[PDB]
């Protein structure tokens, strides 16, 4: 019965089709708090390498903690045009964070699925991501 504390963060990226970031370039969210933990989201619209260039990557970064390492699970999902969390993926288990360290999905969602208006993922050209962080308490 580990003690887990869950919180949810919403980040909306505006005019997403217009993003000019290429492979390797990153968009960072603003910092957010859980308990003295600080986090941010990193998004690579066109991945990080030729490998993942057809995908958007999504990563959770620990910006601040008050001791040495943090143990946490994370779930990323996308808000669709019907109002539903869509394409959720979670860590099956907790990952070890220190300040500066990201964990995430290099291939979080195929670009040509994201850009397909039939999947309703860019309502008004806005990409809305949710991140639920589950921090295991010591």
């Amino acid at each position: 019965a580990a003690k887990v504390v869950k919180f949810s963060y919403m980040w909306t990226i505006n005019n997403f089709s217009f993003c000019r970031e290429e492979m390797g370039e990153v968009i960072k969210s603003s910092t957010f708090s859980s308990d003295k933990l600080k986090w941010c989201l990193r998004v690579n619209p066109k991945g990080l390498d030729e490998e993942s260039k057809d995908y958007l990557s999504l990563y959770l970064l620990l910006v601040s903690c008050p001791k040495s390492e943090v143990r946490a699970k994370f779930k990323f999902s996308i808000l669709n045009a019907k109002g539903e969390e869509t394409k959720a993926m979670e860590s099956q288990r907790a990952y070890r964070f220190v300040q500066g360290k990201d964990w995430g999905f290099k291939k979080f969602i195929r670009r040509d699925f994201l850009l397909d208006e039939a999947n309703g993922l860019l309502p008004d050209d806005k990409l809305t991501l949710f991140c639920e962080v589950s921090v295991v308490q010591d």
């Binding site: 990563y59 995430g104 999905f105 969602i109």
Partner: peptide, 14 residues
């Protein structure tokens, strides 16, 4: 592999 998503988790994205 053409998949909408891949579940692998990794780090040092920078």
């Amino acid at each position: 592999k053409g998949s909408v998503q891949a579940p692998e988790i990794s780090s040092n994205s920078i």
